[PDB]
Amino acid sequence: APSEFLDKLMGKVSGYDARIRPNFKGPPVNVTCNIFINSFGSIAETTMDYRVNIFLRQQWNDPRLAYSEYPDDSLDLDPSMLDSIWKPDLFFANEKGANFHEVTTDNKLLRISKNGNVLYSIRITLVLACPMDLKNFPMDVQTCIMQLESFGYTMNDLIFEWDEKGAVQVADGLTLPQFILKEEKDLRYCTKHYNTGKFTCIEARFHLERQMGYYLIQMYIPSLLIVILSWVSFWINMDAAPARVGLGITTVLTMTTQSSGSRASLPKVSYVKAIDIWMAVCLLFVFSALLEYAAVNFIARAKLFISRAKRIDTVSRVAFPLVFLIFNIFYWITYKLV
Template sequence: MAVTRDQVTELLDSLLVKYNKRFRPGHGETPLYIRAHILIRSMGPVTEIDMSYSMQLYYRQVWYDKRLAFNLGNITELQLNNKFLHKIWVPDTYFLNGKKSYQHDITVPNMFLRMRKDGRLYTSRRLTIRARCPMVLKRYPMDEATCHLNLGSFAYSTDDIFYIWAHGDESVEVTSVTMTQFEMMEIKVSNATLHRNHALYSILGVSFYFTRNLGFFILQTYLPCSLVVSLSWISFWINRDAAPARVLLGVTTILSVAAISMTVREGLPRVPYATALDIFLNVCLVYNLSALIEYAGVNYFTKTGPGDPPENEEDEKALLPLDKMNTHTLEHVDAQNMMESCVAAPQPPSQTLKSKKYGGSCLNAFWNCLTGNTTYRYAKNATMDKERGLSVSRIDRVARYFFPLSFATFNFFYWYLYLTPRRF
């Protein structure tokens, strides 16, 4: 015999006559077991700025309420809409680490109820969850994130309610989740007990393990910064007399790396430690600064500008105006010098001693450079070849090899350290 619609309506009304939704099923008896199941439809984004993540899911839970058991012909299960849920007791499940989560209500509340004749109740809700996800960004952007989702009863302790996963480790399903920056590697579920307000509460946990994709950062940060650093090395092949070109190139590369650094840091929280990306950007900035400082050293040790003072007193006398008293003396000295220049004579001992005195070690030269010893500078330039205008500085020759090799060595250790796989 077929069951009519009126019979179903009469059954539901009769079930609710003496039903009190303020008490849980089996009140005062053994704890009620609630079986949970989650189906994730979409995941993301995972944001570092506020340490959170979001996802859309179907949250399903099953429990028994003997007060709603029925016997109606050949009907074993009734599928009801959300309005019937407001008339019966439902678990007060909430997400412990949730932030601004909500249930979808368009076009109607996205939830339903299935009630079996033995009192088994099955509910499904479509939710968007936004939850906290504390992250340690020391390895950013080669880092791995572990985000947790914890759910349990808001008011009932373990004396009344126990939460368990409906299908064990397979209780959390994922359907074709795609994210821009992260890739989901693993999902783990857990059961725990939380001590709060002098009572124990049953908690279900889900852990999502993510690894970050590097493609965006390599194309937008690492590759441009490496090219800018390489661009700064062009100054080592530019003539030392082209000061505007070398200084402008150095300043431009420094500003370029600084602009990239500021753009990258806009999407990061102000953490009190350096990330892997910060280390790379700062090293790039140091290399650009070093290239500019290298030219300052070249200019200091190998060039004397037209406005620098003469090297000795004889040069000062040579610059004095001629008068009638010393004209004859100067002519006599010039004639004598011309005769001496025709004879091949060895280098004066004073010049040899001068070269040895101002040749010095690298440490001595560096100290005189820092202290701004002008006497040392003029004497150092006096010992050098006066026809060096088109020659290449020894400092530039060393820099052409030292800068690329040291930067390549840094990259080798940097990528080896941060790309080494580590366990979650």
């Protein structure tokens, strides 16, 4: 009996097509779809993309699927039946490759309302390439977007609508290495004009704040502390060049190495990164320290002159912490504030 029902409802009998859209030659079918995301992973500045795998729940109405036969409000047909009925046909626009998970059974869910409302849920893995502005690299917030468009049909045939409530959902414990997602989520429409026609699209907004911790501990503190090691050279014995020259040249080389170190992770980019100016000024300070030693020697190796060097030492040792401090204070305001 139930076999005879699944057979009477869909398939060959009753003359039901997979190929023909629901409500053929009528107002455009609505696909009301929400996405529930499992994770973000391997977000890479280098590859310029992230991966995400999602449950996609898309709902539409079809008249000819409606039954009066069972009392139950919704029936769950086998995931295999899912191939039989017409499906709303969408791709992710920016996908750069994606796949179904076929492990064990196919991951699919199909439940038909007695009304004829159809719920269709599929688990997909996506790569997505998002352009991301690195204009300020360490402190940035990046906006990551996906847009669902119908490649099958035009605007007058098919329409996508986010769900009025709970259109995008996150896993309960979901956390990102390097990143934090913002609870505030933006959702907005788009319409694609292509040479073929105009196609519907809907796009989510994700707002990601990078974790400042790693780059603070790794990149910044050694720079700060090496500059700290640079100032003590001004304190040292006015007579002895080698100690201060060693400290200074070793610190400027170490700073050069520290600078080159950051280059490897980020993708190759035309515009100047935010960390770059920090390294330029740190390198500028240590190089200026070296220049200071060499200049004092240029004055000394030329009895009054060495006295003049004696004052330039003090005024320098007073000037550098103020210079680095005013720079520091002028610096943090831009990136960590406003």
